Amino acid sequence: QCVNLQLPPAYTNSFTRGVYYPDKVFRSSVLHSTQDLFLPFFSNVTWFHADNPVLPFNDGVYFASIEKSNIIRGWIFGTTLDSKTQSLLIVNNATNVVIKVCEFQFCNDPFLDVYMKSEFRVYSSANNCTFEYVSQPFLMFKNLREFVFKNIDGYFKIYSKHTPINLVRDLPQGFSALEPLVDLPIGINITRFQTLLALHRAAYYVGYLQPRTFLLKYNENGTITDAVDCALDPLSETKCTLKSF
Amino acid sequence: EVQLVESGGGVVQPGGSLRLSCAASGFTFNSYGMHWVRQAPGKGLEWVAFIRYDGGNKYYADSVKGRFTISRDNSKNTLYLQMKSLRAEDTAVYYCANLKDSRYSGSYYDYWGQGTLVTVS
Amino acid sequence: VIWMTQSPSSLSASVGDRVTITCQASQDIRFYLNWYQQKPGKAPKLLISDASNMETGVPSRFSGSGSGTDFTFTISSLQPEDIATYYCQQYDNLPFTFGPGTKVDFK
Ligand SMILES: *[C@@H]1O[C@H](CO)[C@@H](O[C@@H]2O[C@H](CO)[C@@H](O)[C@H](O)[C@H]2NC(C)=O)[C@H](O)[C@H]1NC(C)=O
Ligand SMILES: *[C@@H]1O[C@H](CO)[C@@H](O)[C@H](O)[C@H]1NC(C)=O
Ligand SMILES: *[C@@H]1O[C@H](CO)[C@@H](O)[C@H](O)[C@H]1NC(C)=O
Ligand SMILES: *[C@@H]1O[C@H](CO)[C@@H](O)[C@H](O)[C@H]1NC(C)=O
Ligand SMILES: *[C@@H]1O[C@H](CO)[C@@H](O)[C@H](O)[C@H]1NC(C)=O
Ligand SMILES: *[C@@H]1O[C@H](CO)[C@@H](O)[C@H](O)[C@H]1NC(C)=O
């Protein structure tokens, strides 16, 4: 059962945020140059309050949230977002993450209805399902949860990082790389997406990835501690050319 | 809240050039692709050009391809159209728009400006 | 290039009449058709997307359906405020195109 429940955008500065491990190869004590879809440094990221519009997916999405009450539960990814095409639904409940790809007929304004227990009010039907996956929760001071969503050659790739945050209303400064979470062999197009919130009877940020060249610094324990955006400015370009921070 | 304002119209001579611009506000301009559409007096709508959100790929209608250039500056929330070798047949009202598109731009909302008149004579 | 056409080029109807407008494509464009309504002096307004999905704020008297190469736009009961030129647009492939436009007059 669906229930029928526009402000200007706010912006924040993704200072040096949204960098993920480009592959699963171990490297240490080395500067590695790679080209991939990354969030540009110091970009203007759209700030929403958990206000739940349908957004473009473009070439991939950087999604971050700051909350202490688990309001954001999942995402809807697809094109038409109705029964005409296959759509990807990712939701997290108290014990498991449920991922399905079906011809969903989504509600005009989808959400989870929380009374402890909850009822899903996301879609009225789910026909011709092609993919299903179940595992441990993706989501489970304030908690900062960062995700990167890519869709390349039929594979929906998710990267994530979870840290404590002590800021009031913005993104933190400093470097933290996101690790691979899951790689789903789905084979569908994604052009638009929407966020699923838990509403009882928190804010998030959305940025977009670009084909950028990065210089990644791996420390002695094989983790990334810094990075240079080679197209940010003339100094960063010099640093990349000489492979030297 | 959402506005699109065209400017740079006016009267030019055949073989000349004119640079149009569109100021965007009230929405996340830097996340959306943008279109130019023109409408000659007494005629229907004609699609002119499309540019992706990152200012990367550019597409043109056959009738303007090779003469018109589409560009944007996401730091100024401004869309541009540079028209060279203008012909008498290019007389039209030019609109900037964010057209609803479930395949290419991923736009869920449809926005249009008021349009600016370009006359070639 | 996918070429679009519409029929009739113009029609006259009175208030309460049912009005149907046909849009066709030279190529199969599945369901990726937009319908616009333009009044003189104003920019076009989107009424229907994805062939049959109504835009928020659009009166329930408007509807549409179809797929492939043959689409229909319908007004179940024409109102005096519905006198406008209607255009169909395909966005299945670039370049995007608009149809000739169907002019609805007041009988
Ligand atoms: C979270 O969602 C999963 C969906 O898989 C729930 O697990 C299923 O629960 C139904 C009963 O409603 C069983 O018939 C299925 O066999 C279960 N599937 C699996 C893989 O265990 C899970 O119970 C939900 N958790 C909560 C708290 O609602
Ligand atoms: C929500 O709106 C849709 C579209 O008008 C309608 O079909 C549906 O019955 C409404 N649901 C409720 C609970 O009002
Ligand atoms: C971000 O927005 C500010 C205006 O608030 C602008 O001055 C700055 O150049 C923009 N930066 C980028 C990368 O767009
Ligand atoms: C699955 O798709 C086919 C069309 O290929 C359709 O006829 C069928 O009804 C769909 N299945 C369901 C449960 O709707
Ligand atoms: C998915 O994208 C590919 C590449 O553009 C296209 O050929 C295909 O028709 C699309 N399918 C759907 C259902 O959009
Ligand atoms: C690497 O790990 C060791 C513990 O084995 C730790 O003492 C050291 O500080 C770590 N180095 C970095 C750069 O984190």
Numbering used by the authors:
A (entry chain A): 14 to 18, 23 to 67, 80 to 144, 153 to 177, 186 to 246, 263 to 306
B (entry chain H): 1 to 121
C (entry chain L): 1 to 107
Cite, word for word, the article reporting this structure.
Although multiple antigenic sites are present at the surface of the NTD, a single supersite of vulnerability is targeted by neutralizing Abs elicited upon infection and vaccination. This antigenic supersite (designated site i) comprises the NTD N-terminus (residues 14–20), a β-hairpin (residues 140–158), and a loop (residues 245–264). To improve the cryoEM map resolution of the B.1.617.1 and B.1.617.2 NTDs bound by S2L20 and visualize the structural changes associated with their respective constellation of mutations, we used focused 3D classification and local refinement. Two of the three B.1.617.1 NTD mutations, G142D and E154K, map to the supersite β-hairpin and we have previously shown that G142D abrogates binding of 3 out of 5 NTD-specific neutralizing mAbs tested. Out of 11 neutralizing mAbs tested, we observed a 10-fold or greater reduction in binding for 8, 10, 10, 10, 3, and 11 mAbs to B.1.617.1, B.1.617.2, B.1.1.7, B.1.351, P.1, and B.1.427/B.1.429 S as a result of the introduced mutations and deletions whereas the non-neutralizing S2L20 mAb efficiently recognized all S trimers through binding to antigenic site iv, confirming proper folding. Based on these findings, we hypothesized that B.1.617.1 and B.1.617.2 variant S glycoproteins would escape recognition by most neutralizing NTD Abs.
The SARS-CoV-2 spike (S) glycoprotein is exposed at the surface of the virus and mediates entry into host cells. The S glycoprotein is subdivided into two functional subunits, designated S1 and S2, that interact non-covalently after proteolytic cleavage by furin during synthesis. The S1 subunit contains the receptor-binding domain (RBD), which engages the receptor ACE2 (5, 7, 9, 10), and the N-terminal domain (NTD) that recognizes attachment factors. The S2 subunit contains the fusion machinery and undergoes large-scale conformational changes to drive fusion of the virus and host membranes, enabling genome delivery and initiation of infection.
